[PDB]
Amino acid sequence: NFSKAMSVAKQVFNSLTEYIQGPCTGNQQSLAHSRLWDAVVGFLHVFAHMMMKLAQDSSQIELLKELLDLQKDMVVMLLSLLEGNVVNGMIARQMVDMLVESSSNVEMILK
């Protein structure tokens, strides 16, 4: 059931990117005040341990494939929120906090 649930998550992430691409200040500002950061932290928590576990066995290589592009969809959304950002801007600062809170989780995809 993981494959079918993660496919839905890609569409939700893509839809959110559709709202903010072509920078829409109202939609970009609204997404920062919402609970999106909590969801991203939760996803990054799942992403770290699943990547290590799936790489152990070659039988789950196909499952790892949509695991990787789900990260790409989320990162594209994360990059879309930063379009037209200013130094010491609002949206950028919750991003710093969100990475800091999930520092242990994010410092596992890199390796």
Tab-separated table of N, CA and C in Angstrom, residues 7-81:
chain	number	residue	atom	x	y	z
A	7	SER	N	2.124	7.642	-4.539
A	7	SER	CA	1.716	8.230	-5.810
A	7	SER	C	0.769	9.403	-5.589
A	8	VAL	N	-0.135	9.279	-4.616
A	8	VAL	CA	-1.024	10.386	-4.275
A	8	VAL	C	-0.224	11.566	-3.744
A	9	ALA	N	0.802	11.291	-2.933
A	9	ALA	CA	1.613	12.363	-2.368
A	9	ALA	C	2.329	13.162	-3.449
A	10	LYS	N	2.725	12.510	-4.546
A	10	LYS	CA	3.347	13.239	-5.646
A	10	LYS	C	2.372	14.225	-6.273
A	11	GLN	N	1.116	13.811	-6.453
A	11	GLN	CA	0.120	14.705	-7.035
A	11	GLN	C	-0.211	15.863	-6.104
A	12	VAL	N	-0.280	15.609	-4.796
A	12	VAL	CA	-0.527	16.686	-3.843
A	12	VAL	C	0.627	17.679	-3.854
A	13	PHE	N	1.861	17.171	-3.884
A	13	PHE	CA	3.022	18.052	-3.948
A	13	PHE	C	3.044	18.837	-5.253
A	14	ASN	N	2.714	18.177	-6.366
A	14	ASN	CA	2.678	18.865	-7.653
A	14	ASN	C	1.606	19.947	-7.674
A	15	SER	N	0.434	19.656	-7.104
A	15	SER	CA	-0.635	20.649	-7.063
A	15	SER	C	-0.227	21.865	-6.244
A	16	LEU	N	0.448	21.642	-5.114
A	16	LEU	CA	0.915	22.759	-4.299
A	16	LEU	C	1.931	23.602	-5.057
A	17	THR	N	2.791	22.957	-5.846
A	17	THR	CA	3.746	23.696	-6.666
A	17	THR	C	3.032	24.527	-7.725
A	18	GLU	N	1.911	24.021	-8.246
A	18	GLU	CA	1.166	24.757	-9.262
A	18	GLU	C	0.619	26.068	-8.708
A	19	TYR	N	0.294	26.098	-7.413
A	19	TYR	CA	-0.263	27.310	-6.819
A	19	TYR	C	0.775	28.423	-6.735
A	20	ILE	N	2.029	28.078	-6.427
A	20	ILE	CA	3.032	29.092	-6.106
A	20	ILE	C	4.006	29.378	-7.240
A	21	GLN	N	4.136	28.483	-8.218
A	21	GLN	CA	4.992	28.776	-9.358
A	21	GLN	C	4.406	29.925	-10.173
A	22	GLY	N	5.287	30.666	-10.842
A	22	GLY	CA	4.890	31.924	-11.420
A	22	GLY	C	4.542	32.874	-10.296
A	23	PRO	N	5.574	33.325	-9.559
A	23	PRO	CA	5.408	33.685	-8.140
A	23	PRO	C	4.127	34.419	-7.789
A	24	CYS	N	3.320	33.780	-6.946
A	24	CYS	CA	2.104	34.374	-6.400
A	24	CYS	C	2.383	34.701	-4.941
A	25	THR	N	2.488	35.995	-4.634
A	25	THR	CA	2.852	36.405	-3.282
A	25	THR	C	1.819	35.940	-2.263
A	26	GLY	N	0.533	36.048	-2.601
A	26	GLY	CA	-0.499	35.631	-1.666
A	26	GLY	C	-0.431	34.152	-1.341
A	27	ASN	N	-0.279	33.315	-2.369
A	27	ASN	CA	-0.207	31.875	-2.141
A	27	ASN	C	1.096	31.488	-1.453
A	28	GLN	N	2.196	32.163	-1.792
A	28	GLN	CA	3.466	31.882	-1.133
A	28	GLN	C	3.418	32.253	0.344
A	29	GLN	N	2.832	33.409	0.667
A	29	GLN	CA	2.730	33.820	2.063
A	29	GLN	C	1.818	32.886	2.849
A	30	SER	N	0.711	32.457	2.237
A	30	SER	CA	-0.256	31.617	2.939
A	30	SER	C	0.337	30.261	3.298
A	31	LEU	N	1.113	29.670	2.386
A	31	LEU	CA	1.692	28.354	2.629
A	31	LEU	C	2.654	28.347	3.809
A	32	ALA	N	3.291	29.478	4.109
A	32	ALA	CA	4.204	29.537	5.243
A	32	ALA	C	3.464	29.527	6.575
A	33	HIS	N	2.291	30.159	6.639
A	33	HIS	CA	1.531	30.195	7.883
A	33	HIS	C	0.779	28.895	8.135
A	34	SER	N	0.624	28.059	7.111
A	34	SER	CA	-0.116	26.816	7.254
A	34	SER	C	0.744	25.761	7.949
A	35	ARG	N	0.190	24.554	8.062
A	35	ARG	CA	0.872	23.423	8.675
A	35	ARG	C	1.759	22.664	7.694
A	36	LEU	N	2.166	23.305	6.596
A	36	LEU	CA	2.989	22.627	5.598
A	36	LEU	C	4.341	22.224	6.174
A	37	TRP	N	4.927	23.079	7.017
A	37	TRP	CA	6.231	22.772	7.599
A	37	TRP	C	6.179	21.505	8.441
A	38	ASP	N	5.085	21.305	9.180
A	38	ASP	CA	4.945	20.090	9.977
A	38	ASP	C	4.916	18.850	9.091
A	39	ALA	N	4.217	18.926	7.956
A	39	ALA	CA	4.183	17.798	7.031
A	39	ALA	C	5.557	17.526	6.433
A	40	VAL	N	6.292	18.582	6.074
A	40	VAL	CA	7.611	18.403	5.474
A	40	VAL	C	8.569	17.755	6.465
A	41	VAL	N	8.519	18.177	7.731
A	41	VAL	CA	9.346	17.547	8.757
A	41	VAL	C	8.984	16.074	8.899
A	42	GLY	N	7.685	15.765	8.893
A	42	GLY	CA	7.267	14.377	8.980
A	42	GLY	C	7.734	13.546	7.800
A	43	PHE	N	7.656	14.110	6.590
A	43	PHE	CA	8.142	13.396	5.414
A	43	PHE	C	9.642	13.145	5.500
A	44	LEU	N	10.414	14.169	5.878
A	44	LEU	CA	11.862	14.006	5.980
A	44	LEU	C	12.229	12.975	7.038
A	45	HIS	N	11.432	12.882	8.105
A	45	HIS	CA	11.649	11.836	9.097
A	45	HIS	C	11.461	10.454	8.483
A	46	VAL	N	10.427	10.288	7.657
A	46	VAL	CA	10.199	9.006	6.999
A	46	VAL	C	11.266	8.747	5.942
A	47	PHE	N	11.670	9.791	5.213
A	47	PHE	CA	12.573	9.606	4.081
A	47	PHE	C	13.920	9.047	4.523
A	48	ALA	N	14.412	9.481	5.685
A	48	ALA	CA	15.761	9.116	6.107
A	48	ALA	C	15.884	7.617	6.363
A	49	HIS	N	14.965	7.052	7.149
A	49	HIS	CA	15.085	5.647	7.525
A	49	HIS	C	14.682	4.711	6.391
A	50	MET	N	13.696	5.103	5.581
A	50	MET	CA	13.274	4.247	4.475
A	50	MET	C	14.383	4.079	3.444
A	51	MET	N	15.126	5.150	3.157
A	51	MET	CA	16.201	5.059	2.172
A	51	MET	C	17.274	4.070	2.611
A	52	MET	N	17.653	4.104	3.890
A	52	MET	CA	18.663	3.175	4.384
A	52	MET	C	18.161	1.736	4.356
A	53	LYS	N	16.915	1.512	4.781
A	53	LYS	CA	16.386	0.153	4.855
A	53	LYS	C	16.217	-0.457	3.468
A	54	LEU	N	15.703	0.325	2.514
A	54	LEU	CA	15.425	-0.218	1.188
A	54	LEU	C	16.710	-0.555	0.441
A	55	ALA	N	17.769	0.231	0.650
A	55	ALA	CA	19.029	-0.021	-0.039
A	55	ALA	C	19.715	-1.294	0.441
A	56	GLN	N	19.325	-1.821	1.604
A	56	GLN	CA	19.961	-3.029	2.120
A	56	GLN	C	19.701	-4.228	1.216
A	57	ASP	N	18.474	-4.375	0.726
A	57	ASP	CA	18.091	-5.501	-0.117
A	57	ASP	C	17.841	-5.036	-1.546
A	58	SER	N	18.233	-5.869	-2.511
A	58	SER	CA	18.012	-5.558	-3.917
A	58	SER	C	16.588	-5.848	-4.370
A	59	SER	N	15.786	-6.525	-3.546
A	59	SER	CA	14.414	-6.831	-3.938
A	59	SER	C	13.540	-5.583	-3.918
A	60	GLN	N	13.891	-4.600	-3.090
A	60	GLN	CA	13.111	-3.379	-2.946
A	60	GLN	C	13.715	-2.197	-3.696
A	61	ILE	N	14.474	-2.451	-4.764
A	61	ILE	CA	15.045	-1.353	-5.537
A	61	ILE	C	13.950	-0.580	-6.261
A	62	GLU	N	12.923	-1.281	-6.748
A	62	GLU	CA	11.831	-0.603	-7.441
A	62	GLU	C	11.054	0.304	-6.494
A	63	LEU	N	10.854	-0.132	-5.247
A	63	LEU	CA	10.187	0.714	-4.261
A	63	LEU	C	11.005	1.964	-3.966
A	64	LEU	N	12.333	1.843	-3.997
A	64	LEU	CA	13.198	2.991	-3.745
A	64	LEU	C	13.066	4.039	-4.845
A	65	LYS	N	12.615	3.629	-6.033
A	65	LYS	CA	12.604	4.542	-7.173
A	65	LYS	C	11.590	5.667	-6.991
A	66	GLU	N	10.343	5.333	-6.642
A	66	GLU	CA	9.362	6.389	-6.401
A	66	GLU	C	9.604	7.064	-5.059
A	67	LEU	N	10.404	6.439	-4.195
A	67	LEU	CA	10.844	7.119	-2.981
A	67	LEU	C	11.739	8.304	-3.316
A	68	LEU	N	12.607	8.150	-4.320
A	68	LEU	CA	13.529	9.225	-4.672
A	68	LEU	C	12.812	10.376	-5.368
A	69	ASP	N	11.949	10.074	-6.342
A	69	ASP	CA	11.279	11.148	-7.066
A	69	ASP	C	10.220	11.845	-6.222
A	70	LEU	N	9.736	11.204	-5.154
A	70	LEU	CA	8.893	11.922	-4.205
A	70	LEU	C	9.683	13.016	-3.503
A	71	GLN	N	10.948	12.742	-3.175
A	71	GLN	CA	11.816	13.783	-2.636
A	71	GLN	C	12.012	14.905	-3.645
A	72	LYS	N	12.190	14.551	-4.921
A	72	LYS	CA	12.366	15.566	-5.954
A	72	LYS	C	11.135	16.457	-6.065
A	73	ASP	N	9.942	15.868	-5.971
A	73	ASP	CA	8.718	16.662	-6.016
A	73	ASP	C	8.631	17.610	-4.827
A	74	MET	N	9.041	17.149	-3.644
A	74	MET	CA	8.998	18.003	-2.462
A	74	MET	C	10.038	19.113	-2.543
A	75	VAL	N	11.239	18.792	-3.034
A	75	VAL	CA	12.283	19.806	-3.155
A	75	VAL	C	11.888	20.874	-4.168
A	76	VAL	N	11.235	20.480	-5.264
A	76	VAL	CA	10.760	21.462	-6.237
A	76	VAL	C	9.756	22.408	-5.590
A	77	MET	N	8.869	21.872	-4.747
A	77	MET	CA	7.963	22.729	-3.990
A	77	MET	C	8.732	23.636	-3.039
A	78	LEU	N	9.749	23.091	-2.367
A	78	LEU	CA	10.553	23.894	-1.452
A	78	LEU	C	11.290	24.999	-2.196
A	79	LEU	N	11.804	24.694	-3.390
A	79	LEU	CA	12.449	25.716	-4.205
A	79	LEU	C	11.444	26.730	-4.734
A	80	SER	N	10.205	26.300	-4.987
A	80	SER	CA	9.197	27.214	-5.517
A	80	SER	C	8.798	28.261	-4.485
A	81	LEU	N	8.770	27.884	-3.205
A	81	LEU	CA	8.442	28.840	-2.154
A	81	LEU	C	9.490	29.937	-2.024
